[PDB]
Design a protein around this nucleic acid. Sequence first.
RNA 1: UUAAUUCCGAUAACGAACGAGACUCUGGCAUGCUAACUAGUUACGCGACCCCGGUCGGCGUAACUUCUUAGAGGGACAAGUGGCGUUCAGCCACCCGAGAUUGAGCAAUAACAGGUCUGUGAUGCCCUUAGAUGUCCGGGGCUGCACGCGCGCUACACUGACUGGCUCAGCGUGUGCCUACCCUACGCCGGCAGGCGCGGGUAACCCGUUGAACCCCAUUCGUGAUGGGGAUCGGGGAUUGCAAUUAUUCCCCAUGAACGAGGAAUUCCCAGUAAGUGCGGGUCAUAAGCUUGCGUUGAUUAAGUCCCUGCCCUUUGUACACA
Lengths: 75, 67, 185, 142, 56, 19, 62, 100, 141
Amino acid sequence: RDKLNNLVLFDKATYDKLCKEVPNYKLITPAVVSERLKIRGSLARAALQELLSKGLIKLVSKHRAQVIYTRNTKG
Amino acid sequence: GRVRTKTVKKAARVIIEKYYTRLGNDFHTNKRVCEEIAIIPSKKLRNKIAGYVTHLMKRIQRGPVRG
Amino acid sequence: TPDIKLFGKWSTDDVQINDISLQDYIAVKEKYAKYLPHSAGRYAAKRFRKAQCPIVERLTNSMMMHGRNNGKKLMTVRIVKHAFEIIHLLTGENPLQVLVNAIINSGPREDSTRIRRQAVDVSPLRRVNQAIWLLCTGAREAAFRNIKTIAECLADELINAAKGSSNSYAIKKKDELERVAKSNR
Amino acid sequence: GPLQSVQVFGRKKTATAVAHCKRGNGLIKVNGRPLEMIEPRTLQYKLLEPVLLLGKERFAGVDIRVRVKGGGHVAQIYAIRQSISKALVAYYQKYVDEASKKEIKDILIQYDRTLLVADPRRCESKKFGGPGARARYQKSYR
Amino acid sequence: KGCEVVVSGKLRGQRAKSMKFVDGLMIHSGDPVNYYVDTAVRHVLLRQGVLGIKVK
Amino acid sequence: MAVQISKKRKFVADGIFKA
Amino acid sequence: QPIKLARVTKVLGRTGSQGQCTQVRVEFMDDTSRSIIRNVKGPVREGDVLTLLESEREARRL
Amino acid sequence: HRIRITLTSRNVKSLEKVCADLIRGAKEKNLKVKGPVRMPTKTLRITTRKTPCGEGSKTWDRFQMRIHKRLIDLHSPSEIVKQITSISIEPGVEVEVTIA
Amino acid sequence: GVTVKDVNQQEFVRALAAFLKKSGKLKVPEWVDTVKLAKHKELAPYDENWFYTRAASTARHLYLRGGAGVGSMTKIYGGRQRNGVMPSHFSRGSKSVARRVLQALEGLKMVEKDQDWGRKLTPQGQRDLDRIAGQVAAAKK
RNA sequence: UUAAUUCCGAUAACGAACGAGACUCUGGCAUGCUAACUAGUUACGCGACCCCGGUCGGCGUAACUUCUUAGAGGGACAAGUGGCGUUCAGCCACCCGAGAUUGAGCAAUAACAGGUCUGUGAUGCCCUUAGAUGUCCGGGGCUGCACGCGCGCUACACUGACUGGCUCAGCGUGUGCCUACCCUACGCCGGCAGGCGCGGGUAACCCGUUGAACCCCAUUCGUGAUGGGGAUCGGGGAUUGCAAUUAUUCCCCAUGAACGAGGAAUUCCCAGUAAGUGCGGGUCAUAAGCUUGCGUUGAUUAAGUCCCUGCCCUUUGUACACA
C-alpha cells in the first residue's frame, strides 16, 4: 500500500527546520518531531542532546521509555 | 438462608417449657443456661438453640405461645 | 497538611462539575482526594460500592487490557502520569478539569434495547462506565502498529473529547450509540 | 529511667512486617536503609503517607528499624505501611493520655481503614477439572 | 439400631439380579458413618458363577 | 536393620505389613 | 424541542426479553409536581438523576 | 544428664496423653525438665482417579496423612527413665529416648 | 559518615567502576571480546568494557550477604530462557566468568576465602566501599 | 416462606424414618494460656569499618514469646436497632466488629443390556495346549502420510523485542527389599553442555534466608514484514545407557518458512475470581508442549430474568408404554 521512507540522518532542508521551528512548539517529544519534519525514530533522540547542552530547550523529566521537552522560558 | 431445622425448635420449646425461670433475654447468659443442664454435642448447634430461645423468650411477654 | 493533598503533583481546589446528574458517583474532591490511584479497593463487593471509588483509578484499571497488558497496574500508572504531563503543556488547564469534561460527553443519553425491538433510556452509572471503556479503547487502536506512544495517544483522547469535536473515538461512538436509539422508537 | 520497647505487626497477603519502636532520635529505616530508598520506585507516596498526615511531630523522639519477608514486591509496601501506623497508636495509649491515642485514630480510619485492620483476603485453591479455581478446560461434542 | 443386606448375581436365571434386605435405622452421609456404621464385602463362587454380599 | 531408613518410609512400610 | 432532567421516587420492577431493563417512576425537578413511568437500561438505584432528549413519552405498565 | 524423649505419631489425641504422663511423673520424683517442643506437621499426599479403566468424566480422589511430632527434654539418669517410659504408653504413639 | 545501604544502589555500581578503571591491576580475561555472559543469552554484553562494571557488583553483593561460593553467584543474577516455540524456564547464570570475577579480586586482597562456605570481604577492602559512598552522595542534592 | 418436601400453619389422617441440614477437614481474629540451642527477637559484652552516633544474615549467652511452630480454650447466634409481614415462618438497611453467605469432602429411593474379563492367585461357559495363542531370545512395528476432525504450545510486536543493573514467595521433594537408581553446598579444569576432586543431609538439623518469573531502573532498536516470529534445515561437540540410525535429551555456529489479529460456527468464567507469570509431585537410566498442587501481579462487567439450551412442583390434555 505505502511505506515510511524515514531519514536516518539530517538533510540541510531538515537541519535548517530543527534549529528554528522545534523550540517554538509547545511539546517536543521522540514521536511528534518524527512526524512533522519527516524523520526516523533513531534520529529524533540523537539530535535533542545538542539543543539541551547549548541551552535552547527545557526538559521535564526523562523516563526509560518517554522523554518530554517544552518551549523554553522567558528568562 | 437462615432458617433452623426441627432439631432446633424441638430442643428450644423443650428448654423454655421447664426452665422459664432461670432463662431470659440475654444471648450471652442463656448460652450457659442451655449448657449447664443439657447434653449438646456441637458449639454451632449450641448457639442456634440458645438464641431462638431469646427469640421465643420475648414472645411470652406479649401473648400465649402455642407448643 | 490537613487541608490540601497534592494528587501526585496536581491540586484539588475549585474543580468545576457543572452537571448535578453526575455529581455523586464521580468522587475526587474534598473528602475523596488521595496521592495514588492504585488501590487494594474492595469495590468489587456490593452492587454499588463501585461508585464510591476514584474516577482516575477506574481508568487505570481499564487500561490494562489484552493478555500481555492484563494485571500490570504499576506499569499503567506510568502511562497516566505521563499522560497528565502533556495535557498541562499542550493547552494549559489542570488535568483534573480536562478528564472530568470528557466523561459527560462520551457515554450515551440513550441505548437501544431488545424487547421485538424498542429503544430505552440510560442510568447515570451507565454513562460513566460506558464512557471510560469508550475512551480507553480509542487510544488503544491509535497507538498500535504506530510510532506514537500510549501516553501521547491517551493524550490524543482527552483534549478533543471534553471539547466534544466528534473526530475522536469517544464522541463518534456517542454519535452512533444514540442514532440507533432514534431509529426504531 | 526505664525503656519503652514496642514491637507490632501488620500482614499483607502472605507476609508480616514487625516494627520496633523505642525512645531515641527520629529515624525510620527498613533492613538498614531508610524508607525513601527501597525498590521499586513507582509507589513513592505509600511509605511516605503515614508521616505527612500525622506530621513530623510524632517522629521527633522515636527510632525504628523495620523488617520484611514473605509475599511479593507489591504485597510488602502495604505491609510496612500497615505496621508503623498500628505501632504508633500502641506507643501512645498506656504511656501517656488516651486523648492523643483516639485523636490519632480519627485521622487514619476516616482516610483508609486498611491502615489499622488487614485484608482477610487469600488465594482460593485449585480444584481438578480445569486450570484454576473456577475456570474449566474447554469442552466439546461431535 | 438397624441394618441393610444386599445380594447380587444370577439367582434363578440366565440374567442377573440383586436383592436388598433391610430393617431398622440406617444413615449414609456426613462424618458419623465411619464410627457409627459397619461395612464388609465377600464374593462367593457357586457352580454357575459369582455372588456378592454387602453386609452393613 | 543397618542402613537407617526415613520416618515417612518407616510409618508407611508399617501400614503394608499390617494389610 | 426541550431537553430536561428527571429525579427518581420509586422503582417498580424488571422488564425486557432478558431481564435487561428496569421500570422507574420519576418525579420532575424543573416543575415540583409532575411524573411519567419510563423504561431504563443501566443499573438504577433510588435517589438519583437522569438526562432526557424528549420528555413526553410514557412506557406501558406491566 | 540431658535426655530427649522424642515422640513421633499419627494420632493427635493419644500423643497428647503420652507426653502428659512423662511430665505428670517427673515432678513427683522432681527432676527438672524442658516443656513440649513440637515440630512442623507433614501432610503426605497421593492423588488418583477412582475408576478401573478410563471411562466416564475424570474425577479425582485425594488421600492425606497428617504425621505429628513432639519432644521433651529431661535432666535425669537413664536407669531412672527405664522405669518411667515402660510405665504406661498407648498404641497410637511410639517413643524414642535419646540418651545424650 | 555514610554507608553502602543508605546510598542509592543503581548509581553505586556505576561509581566503583570508575575507581576500578583508575587502579590498573584487575587481571582481565584473554577472551573478553568473544565470550557470552551466560548460556541463556543470544548476544554478548553491550558495554565494551563490561568486566569493570561486574567486578564491582560481586563486591557490593558480598557486603550484604557474605560466605557465598561460585554456585550461588550463578543463581545471584538469575534469568529465564525464552525457549523458541516451547515455554520459558529458569536457567542459571555462569560458573567461569563469575569464577573469573572472584580471582580478579583475590590477588588484589579484597575477597578472602573463609569457613562457613565461600568468600567474604577482607577488613582493609571493605573500607573502600564506604569511602566512595561519600563521593556519590556529594553530587545528588 | 426458604438455598432447600426448609420452617409457619391448616388437615380423614396418626405417629415415624432416609436424602437435605447437623456433621469432619480447611481459610480468616486472640500482645490472654501451655512452651521452645531441630524456631526467633530484644537485651549485653567483643571485633570490623565509616566522620558521640551510624552499619554488620561478623562472633557470643542477660531476659522474654509480638513474629515462627501447634496444643488447649474462646469467638457469630438474624444477637442489637429501624421499617416491612397471619406480627408468626422470615427479610432487606444501618451501628459494634477479625468475619454478618470462604472453599472442599461426605451423599437417598429407582435404574443403564453405560465402561472395565488389557488392575487382579475376583469368575462361569467356550477355545487352544508341544508344529501351543504357554515361555524366553534375537529383528522390526505401535511415530509409517495426498487428506478430515479433536484437546494444546509459540505469534503476529513500540502497553514492545534485545543488553546490563536492582529488589520479593509458597506447596513439597530427597541415599529405596528383588532394586542397580538420592538431594546437593565448597574448591578448581572449560565458550557452552559438563568434568576433577571435597564436604553436609534418613531432614523445622544439610541443599536454603529456597537470592523464582511477570513486574522495576538505564541503555540501543524505529512502523520495515524489521533487532517481530522463529518453523525448516547443514556441520561440530557433551551426557544417560548392553544398543540412539527412523535424528532419546543438552550444548555452539550457520539457515531463517508462514503469519499484519483468523468467514460460517464455538467454549469457560462473577473476587484474591478471571487473565499473565513463573515455581514444585506425578511419569523418570534418560524426561514436559500433558495431568494433580502453590504462590505472585491483578482486572473491566452484574446483584437480574425465563427470550434462546435444560431441571423441579401443580392443573391439563394423548390412538404414545421399545414412551
